[PDB]
Each structure stands twice: as structure tokens, then as C-alpha cells.
Amino acid sequence: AGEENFFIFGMRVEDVDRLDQRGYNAQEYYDRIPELRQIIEQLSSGFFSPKQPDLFKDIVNMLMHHDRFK
Amino acid sequence: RKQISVRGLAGVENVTELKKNFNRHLHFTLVKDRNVATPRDYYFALAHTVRDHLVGRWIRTQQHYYEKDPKRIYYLSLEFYMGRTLQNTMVNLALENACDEATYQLGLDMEELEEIEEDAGLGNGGLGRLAACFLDSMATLGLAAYGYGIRYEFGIFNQKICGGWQMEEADDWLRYGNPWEKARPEFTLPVHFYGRVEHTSQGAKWVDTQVVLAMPYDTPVPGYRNNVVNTMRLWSAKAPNDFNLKDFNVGGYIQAVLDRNLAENISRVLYPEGKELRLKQEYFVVAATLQDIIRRFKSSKFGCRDPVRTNFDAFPDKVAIQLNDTHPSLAIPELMRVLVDLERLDWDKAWEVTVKTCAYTNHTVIPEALERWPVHLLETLLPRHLQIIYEINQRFLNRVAAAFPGDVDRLRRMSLVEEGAVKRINMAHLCIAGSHAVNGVARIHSEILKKTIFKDFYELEPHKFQNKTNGITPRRWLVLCNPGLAEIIAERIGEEYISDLDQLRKLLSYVDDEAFIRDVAKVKQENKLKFAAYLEREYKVHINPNSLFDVQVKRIHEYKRQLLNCLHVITLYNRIKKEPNKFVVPRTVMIGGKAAPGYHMAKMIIKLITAIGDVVNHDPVVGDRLRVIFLENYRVSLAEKVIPAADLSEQISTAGTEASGTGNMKFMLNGALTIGTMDGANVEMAEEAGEENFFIFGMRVEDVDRLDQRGYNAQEYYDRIPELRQIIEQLSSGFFSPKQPDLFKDIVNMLMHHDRFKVFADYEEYVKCQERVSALYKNPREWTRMVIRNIATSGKFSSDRTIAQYAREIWGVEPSRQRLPAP
Numbered sequence: 001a002g003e004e005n006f007f008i009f010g011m012r013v014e015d016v017d018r019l020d021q022r023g024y025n026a027q028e029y030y031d032r033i034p035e036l037r038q039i040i041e042q043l044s045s046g047f048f049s050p051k052q053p054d055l056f057k058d059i060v061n062m063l064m065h066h067d068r069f070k
Numbered sequence: 071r072k073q074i075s076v077r078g079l080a081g082v083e084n085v086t087e088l089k090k091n092f093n094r095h096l097h098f099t100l101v102k103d104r105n106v107a108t109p110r111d112y113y114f115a116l117a118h119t120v121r122d123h124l125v126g127r128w129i130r131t132q133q134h135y136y137e138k139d140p141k142r143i144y145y146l147s148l149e150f151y152m153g154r155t156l157q158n159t160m161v162n163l164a165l166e167n168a169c170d171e172a173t174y175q176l177g178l179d180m181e182e183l184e185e186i187e188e189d190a191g192l193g194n195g196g197l198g199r200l201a202a203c204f205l206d207s208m209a210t211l212g213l214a215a216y217g218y219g220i221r222y223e224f225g226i227f228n229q230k231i232c233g234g235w236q237m238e239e240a241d242d243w244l245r246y247g248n249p250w251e252k253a254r255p256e257f258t259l260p261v262h263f264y265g266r267v268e269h270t271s272q273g274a275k276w277v278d279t280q281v282v283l284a285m286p287y288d289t290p291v292p293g294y295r296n297n298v299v300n301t302m303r304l305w306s307a308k309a310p311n312d313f314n315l316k317d318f319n320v321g322g323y324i325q326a327v328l329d330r331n332l333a334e335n336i337s338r339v340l341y342p343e344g345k346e347l348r349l350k351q352e353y354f355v356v357a358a359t360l361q362d363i364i365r366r367f368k369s370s371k372f373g374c375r376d377p378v379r380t381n382f383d384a385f386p387d388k389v390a391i392q393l394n395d396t397h398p399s400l401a402i403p404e405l406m407r408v409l410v411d412l413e414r415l416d417w418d419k420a421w422e423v424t425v426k427t428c429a430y431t432n433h434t435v436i437p438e439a440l441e442r443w444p445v446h447l448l449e450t451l452l453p454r455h456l457q458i459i460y461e462i463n464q465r466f467l468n469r470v471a472a473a474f475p476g477d478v479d480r481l482r483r484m485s486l487v488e489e490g491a492v493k494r495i496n497m498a499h500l501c502i503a504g505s506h507a508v509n510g511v512a513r514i515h516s517e518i519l520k521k522t523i524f525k526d527f528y529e530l531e532p533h534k535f536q537n538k539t540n541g542i543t544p545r546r547w548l549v550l551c552n553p554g555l556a557e558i559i560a561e562r563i564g565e566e567y568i569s570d571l572d573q574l575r576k577l578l579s580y581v582d583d584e585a586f587i588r589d590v591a592k593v594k595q596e597n598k599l600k601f602a603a604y605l606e607r608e609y610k611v612h613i614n615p616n617s618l619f620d621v622q623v624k625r626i627h628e629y630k631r632q633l634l635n636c637l638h639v640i641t642l643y644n645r646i647k648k649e650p651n652k653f654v655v656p657r658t659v660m661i662g663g664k665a666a667p668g669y670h671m672a673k674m675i676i677k678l679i680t681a682i683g684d685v686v687n688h689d690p691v692v693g694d695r696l697r698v699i700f701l702e703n704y705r706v707s708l709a710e711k712v713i714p715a716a717d718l719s720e721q722i723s724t725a726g727t728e729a730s731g732t733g734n735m736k737f738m739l740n741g742a743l744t745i746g747t748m749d750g751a752n753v754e755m756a757e758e759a760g761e762e763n764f765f766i767f768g769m770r771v772e773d774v775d776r777l778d779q780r781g782y783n784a785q786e787y788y789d790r791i792p793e794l795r796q797i798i799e800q801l802s803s804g805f806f807s808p809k810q811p812d813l814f815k816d817i818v819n820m821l822m823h824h825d826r827f828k829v830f831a832d833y834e835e836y837v838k839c840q841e842r843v844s845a846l847y848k849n850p851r852e853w854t855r856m857v858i859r860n861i862a863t864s865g866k867f868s869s870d871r872t873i874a875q876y877a878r879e880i881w882g883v884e885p886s887r888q889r890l891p892a893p
């Protein structure tokens with residue numbers, strides 16, 4: 001198709017291998033990236049869940065603290 | 071009739087009498103003979119000779135509570151880790167010397183026979199050890215208490231270590247009788263299941279329910295020389311046996327041979343998810359129990375003291391119940407069903423009584439571990455019950471609303487009905503609302519309840535949330551298990567300590583008396599001495615008596631961290647090998663404890679410990695400077711051999727996790743220095759003994775939240791600490807596992823990339839605090855004066871203190887070490 005003709009992005013295999021080697025910490029991205037910080041805090045307040053705000057709690061921790069898939 | 075008395079049948083501290091009794095029971099109770107008796111047999115001759123006395127005073131005490139009619143207390147716990155009765159009974163009734171002599175004059179040795187008893191397998195860990203202590207303290211305080219649980223027939227598993235892997239065999243401790251128990255077929259009760267609630271005219275009726283029988287078994291519990299003897303009453307489930315033709319359900323189909331075995335295995339085993347049997351086991355223990363509880367309120371004289379309704383108004387004056395952990399919560403709506411539906415009160419006169427009866431001990435901190443049953447699951451087998459929980463719920467949320475008006479979100483958090491995919495009933499929140507007292511079991515713990523877990527229950531009900539720090543009996547865990555240290559502490563200050571433990575501060579005088587200090591150190595030389603030997607006799611190893619007996623006995627679970635301890639032992643191993651001729655204090659590291667089946671991490675840590683064992687214990691360069699031993703089938707009678715022998719108690723969990731920890735304590739009283747993190751019951755020990763008599767280390771709860779805050783990243787500790795990096799690469803290459811290199815792949819990876827508990831983080835600090843430990847062991851007079859200071863301070867940890875605090879601030883009765891009359 002041609003590389004231009006394709007929206008191919010993000011990490012390739014090397015960088016994940018290299019981030020597994022240098023330890024991946026999810027907090028560090030959260031503290032820089034500003035709309036991210038914002039939407040995680042939205043998920044915890046229970047923006048997207050008023051009746052059980054608490055409900056998405058495990059998606060947060062999964063990400064925040066223990067995500068294999070980056 | 072008056073002619074039929076307890077009276078003529080004894081001689082008590084009398085050799086010749088007990089030798090006469092022993093010969094009857096061997097030949098008339100046992101219908102055995104000297105020409106035929108086993109060791110197993112001479113302990114049922116002896117245990118029966120020691121039981122006569124144990125029951126004559128039970129006869130007397132129970133009559134004594136009917137006549138005195140004291141408010142009664144009932145500890146509802148699904149696990150009583152009793153474990154070995156001959157000696158606690160011999161020493162709580164003071165017949166040990168007289169017996170030792172009788173059996174001795176007969177020509178058997180009493181110690182032989184003592185070891186044939188298999189531990190009374192009705193328990194599992196913390197929760198259930200505790201309950202067992204509280205019975206010896208509650209009898210001793212002359213309180214009219216009771217212990218009610220299930221009699222498990224197969225306990226929980228016995229641990230076998232085969233191929234350095236854990237094999238779970240079955241505990242049929244019930245194999246040749248348990249002489250300490252009495253079967254009462256005649257008080258069998260219906261426990262009801264499934265069914266439907268037919269609401270008729272004046273209420274609702276719970277119709278069409280399967281019935282299971284609850285048979286009781288009575289085990290007398292002797293207080294310490296105060297002549298009381300209470301009861302632990304456990305229930306054995308049993309099938310109805312109409313199953314053949316009587317009912318016209320069978321004949322044509324006995325596929326309900328099933329009903330029969332699903333019923334018997336409520337009493338078959340301990341547990342060990344939302345399982346229909348766990349709830350069956352919970353309801354079962356409660357219900358047959360609440361009919362004995364209400365029965366005695368009617369029959370124990372109070373049938374002639376009715377005044378009005380044989381009133382259940384006089385019920386919280388004269389009965390008291392304890393929910394020891396959410397495993398009896400159904401006692402609360404089981405009681406509201408008995409009062410409203412079966413008796414006939416209105417729902418407030420029924421609730422007043424229930425909330426004025428139930429007090430519930432807590433022992434959990436993490437949300438994730440509070441009890442929560444699915445409501446459909448309560449619909450099918452307990453339909454009336456989940457109707458009564460919903461009543462409770464409506465009203466409790468209307469109270470809450472009277473109080474925090476406008477807040478809906480609090481209402482939707484405090485309710486007993488949790489919502490998600492699969493709605494559940496917060497058995498935690500049931501317990502709190504149906505109670506006049508909630509209490510953690512250690513100060514840091516009770517406060518985190520009020521602060522973070524149970525908080526909206528404390529703004530609403532502040533007064534309710536107390537605490538009553540855990541404690542241990544001194545009789546099992548110092549006299550019985552340590553006659554030697556029992557002996558020299560008697561020399562310098564006499565008995566009242568055994569019956570009054572903060573009286574051990576008197577020992578702070580002797581801190582520098584060279585007699586004392588040779589004698590505390592000598593008693594320990596000899597406790598280690600015999601344990602080196604069973605570690606040869608009953609299992610195998612070459613122990614060096616003269617080493618730092620480093621022990622760690624915990625639930626083999628990730629957060630308890632025997633992988634922090636595995637890393638320090640690989641680090642001594644490496645050290646002693648890079649430099650074979652440096653003086654490093656010789657150690658015997660010993661770890662023991664059960665996995666609990668199917669937990670794969672745990673089962674791999676038990677193998678890790680034995681892999682390391684095999685390597686260091688066969689490395690010739692090492693000699694006896696280092697040995698790693700896995701103790702197998704840790705249970706109450708090992709705990710009583712290993713604890714006298716320990717010099718270092720390793721109480722190392724992640725800062726913030728242990729809620730308290732009953733064994734923390736067992737060690738202190740037995741003179742062993744504690745290495746451990748600032749959490750649980752370390753917190754009030756490092757306060758009682760003064761911090762510098764303690765080896766407190768690591769991260770504090772403070773800096774664990776902090777670590778989570780900037781995100782713990784294991785690899786950075788990996789990249790600075792050079793001995794760590796070394797052990798990780800040893801684990802992976804299969805230095806410890808040569809035939810399968812890749813065998814510890816999971817543990818490694820765990821540590822390195824997803825350890826919820828921050829083992830690496832406490833690795834520099836822990837190796838250095840141990841360096842300071844071997845340093846102080848290298849100087850016998852100061853390590854012994856630390857020890858004297860930790861023993862002198864044990865008092866804040868008697869179960870006699872804890873039980874007192876129960877009797878006075880929750881159950882409302884008064885302790886008494888006064889002797890009851892009897893025989």
C-alpha cells in the first residue's frame with residue numbers, strides 16, 4: 001500500500017522490549033500527559049458511572065499500576 | 071434421686087487413685103488388656119483417667135450456671151483450632167505431677183503417650199487459634215461462656231512435602247475416637263434449607279424446605295485451676311435417614327443419595343469463592359446454635375421467670391453472642407426470623423434485642439476480603455432470610471437518611487445490597503447494622519476501620535466502633551509449652567503471672583542479675599537442644615545447636631513474604647561462599663506453614679525454600695554455618711515445639727497489611743527477638759518493649775502509599791543492588807533447580823514485573839537489620855538482656871487482658887479469677 005498510505009504508528013517491537021528492560025511505570029505518563037490525568041480522574045470520580053462511581057475502579061488500577069500491554 | 075450424686079467418685083491428687091482409674095478404663099472402657107495394648111491404647115486409658123476429673127467439675131459448673139443464671143456468652147466461630155488436650159487439662163487441673171508419677175509407677179512414660187494425641191483438627195490459622203485462647207481465658211475469668219462451631223470430621227489437610235512439593239493428605243484425626251468429646255445424639259436439631267415463603271394472615275411461613283440434622287458434640291474446656299469448665303459444643307451435620315421408602319420420593323428414585331452426601335459434607339471439611347456449600351456451612355453452624363441459645367433462655371430456670379412473653383427484653387441482659395468474623399452474620403437475620411416469625415414480636419421489639427445482642431470482632435483490612443454473598447444465592451436456599459435482610463436494609467437506609475439528609479450517594483454506599491453485574495449482599499454491612507459493638511483486634515487496625523473502611527458507619531454510629539487487641543493465653547503458650555522458662559520465672563517472682571500476665575514487668579529488676587541472665591540463656595540452650603533432635607528423630611537434617619534459630623511460621627502467602635526471607639538466605643549463602651573464611655554467625659533458618667491448595671505462587675514458594683535448602687545443606691564449603699529447613703505440617707503442636715526453640719521471630723509482612731497476628735506474641739513470651747515491619751501487633755509490641763528492644767525495619771505504611779503514588783518499579787532496585795541482581799540471575803539460570811533451569815520463571819517474573827507487595831523495596835533495609843541481628847547474637851549477655859526485656863513486657867498480650875476488655879466494654883459481665891467450689 002505504501003507506508004504513507006497507511007496510518008501505522010506508535011511503538012514497534014524494539015521499544016516494548018526496551019521498555020520491559022527499563023521497567024515500564026504507568027504513573028510517570030499520567031503525571032505528564034494532561035488530558036490523561038484528567039480522564040483517569042474522571043473515571044475514578046464516577047463521571048461515567050454516578051450510581052457506582054467506584055465501578056470502574058479496577059480498570060484504573062490495572063492501567064495506573066499493572067498493565068502488561070502498555 | 072438425691073441418692074444419685076457426683077459426690078463419692080474421686081480422690082484427685084492421688085497417685086494411687088489415678089493408677090486405679092487407669093486400670094479400669096484400659097480394661098473396662100477400652101476392653102483392651104496389657105497383653106494387647108498399643109501406645110495409642112495406653113493414651114485412651116490415661117486420657118480417660120484424666121477425663122473423669124475434667125467432667126466431674128463440668129457437672130458442677132453447669133449446674134452452677136443454671137442456679138446462678140448469669141448473662142451468657144456464646145462465641146460463634148467457624149474454626150476452633152484446639153489441638154492437643156492431655157497436658158493443658160493436666161496442667162489446668164493440676165494433676166500433671168500426680169499423673170506423671172502414676173503412669174510412671176505403672177511403667178509407661180507420660181511424655182510418650184502425650185505425643186500420640188493427633189491435633190484436634192477443628193481449625194486452620196489466626197482466626198481459629200484465637201478462639202481457642204479466648205476459651206481458656208474466658209473459663210479462667212470464671213465467665214459463663216460457650217464455643218459453638220461445626221465439628222469438622224476431616225479438619226483441613228495435613229501437609230506432606232514430597233519432592234520438595236506440597237502434597238495435601240487428609241486429616242482424619244477422628245480416626246480412633248477423640249476422647250475429649252461427648253456425642254449427644256439426643257439434642258439433634260432440624261436445620262432448614264431451600265423452600266418458599268408463604269405469607270399467611272399474621273406473617274410469613276417458610277415452607278417446603280429440606281431439612282438436615284445438626285447433631286452436637288460436647289467438649290468440656292477447663293479454666294486454669296479455678297475449677298470452672300465450660301463447653302465447646304460443635305455440630306456434626308447429618309442426613310435424615312428416611313431415604314429408602316419412607317417418604318414416597320424414593321423407591322423409584324434414590325438419586326437423592328445425593329441430598330444425603332451433600333448434607334453430610336457440611337461437617338466433612340474446612341474451607342481451606344461464592345460457593346453454595348460455604349453459605350450452607352455458615353447457616354448450619356448458626357441455626358442449630360440459635361435454637362440451643364434461645365432454648366436455654368427459656369429452659370435455664372427463665373421458663374419460671376417469664377414475667378411477660380418469657381421476654382426477650384430480658385434476652386440481652388441474659389444472653390450475649392459474638393460474631394467472630396462475618397462467618398456467623400446470618401445469626402442476626404436468623405435471630406430476627408426466630409423472634410418475629412417463630413416467637414411473635416413486632417419488628418422493632420425484635421431488632422432492639424438483635425442489635426443489643428450482636429457484637430462482631432473484625433480481622434480484615436482490605437475491602438476485597440469482606441464477606442459478600444450473591445442475592446440470588448440467598449434467594450434459592452435462604453428465601454425468608456434474604457427477605458428479612460432486605461427489611462433491615464430499607465430501614466437502616468432510612469435511619470441513615472434521617473441522619474445525612476440530602477445525601478443519596480452515602481445512601482447508595484452504606485446499604486447492605488451491592489450493585490454491579492451480579493448484585494451481592496455485603497455481609498460486612500449486615501454485621502455492623504445488626505450490632506451494639508464492632509471492634510478491630512489491634513489499635514492500628516480498629517482505627518483504619520473507622521477511618522477508611524467502615525467510616526460512614528462511624529459518623530452515624532460512633533460509639534459502636536471500639537477495639538480489643540488480640541492476645542494469647544499464657545497457659546498453652548508459656549507454661550505448657552515452656553516448663554523451663556516457666557520454672558525460672560517462678561523462682562524470681564512466683565505464679566500470679568500465669569493467671570495475671572502484666573505482672574512480668576517485675577522481671578525488669580533482674581535485667582542485670584547474672585543468675586537470671588545465665589538462666590534465661592540456659593533454658594533456651596536446652597529448648598533448642600531438644601528441637602535439633604526431633605529435627606533428626608521425626609524427620610531428618612544435622613542441626614548445629616549453637617546457631618541463630620531464625621524462624622518464620624506464616625500462612626504461605628505472597629504478602630507475608632517468605633520470598634524476602636528466601637533472598638536474605640541466598641545472600642548469606644553467596645557471602646559465605648565468596649569468602650569461606652569470614653566469621654559469619656551460624657544460623658538455622660526454618661520456614662513452615664501451609665500453602666492452601668491451588669494457590670500456585672504459594673506452592674512455588676514452598677518449593678523455592680526446599681530448593682535452596684537442598685543446595686546450602688549439601689554445600690561443603692558451607693559446613694554448618696548456614697542451613698535452610700522447611701518445617702512440615704505446621705499446626706498447633708509444632709508451634710508449641712518450634713516457638714520455645716526460636717531465637718529470631720521473623721514478622722516481616724508489607725507495611726500495612728497484617729491486622730495484628732497472634733504468633734507475634736507467642737515468640738516474645740518465649741524469648742526470641744522479633745525482626746519485623748512496623749505494622750499489625752508489632753506496633754504495640756515495639757511500644758511495650760520499647761522500640762530499641764525490637765528489630766523494626768523497612769517501609770512504614772506512609773511510604774508504601776507513597777511508593778504506589780510515584781509507582782514502584784522493581785527494576786531500579788535491580789539496577790542498583792548488586793547482590794539482588796545476582797540472586798535474580800541465579801534463580802532464572804536454574805542454579806537452585808539444575809534439572810529444570812526455567813522452573814522458577816514465574817517467581818522471578820513476579821518479583822520483577824508485578825509484585826503487589828514490594829519485596830525488592832524492603833531488600834537493602836532488611837539485609838542490614840539482620841546484619842545488626844547476627845552482630846548482637848555475637849555477644850550473649852546483651853542479646854539475653856534484650857530477651858529479658860521482651861519477656862518482662864509480654865503482659866499487654868495475655869488473652870486474659872483481651873477477654874477482660876470484652877467482658878467489661880462489650881458483653882457487659884465481670885471477670886473473676888476466683889475459684890469456683892467443686893470437685
Ligand SMILES: Nc1ncnc2c1ncn2[C@@H]1O[C@H](COP(=O)(O)O)[C@@H](O)[C@H]1O
Binds near residue numbers: 132133136366
Ligand atoms: N435445670 C438444671 N439444673 C441443674 N443443672 C442443670 C440444669 N440444666 C442443665 N444443667 C447442667 O448443665 C449441663 C448442660 O446442660 P444443657 O444446656 O442441657 O446441655 C447439664 O449436663 C447439667 O450439668
Ligand SMILES: *Cc1c(COP(=O)(O)O)cnc(C)c1O
Binds near residue numbers: 194731
Ligand atoms: C498462633 C498460631 C497461628 C497464628 O498465626 P499468626 O501468623 O501468628 O497470626 C498459626 N498457627 C498456629 C499453630 C498457631 O498456634
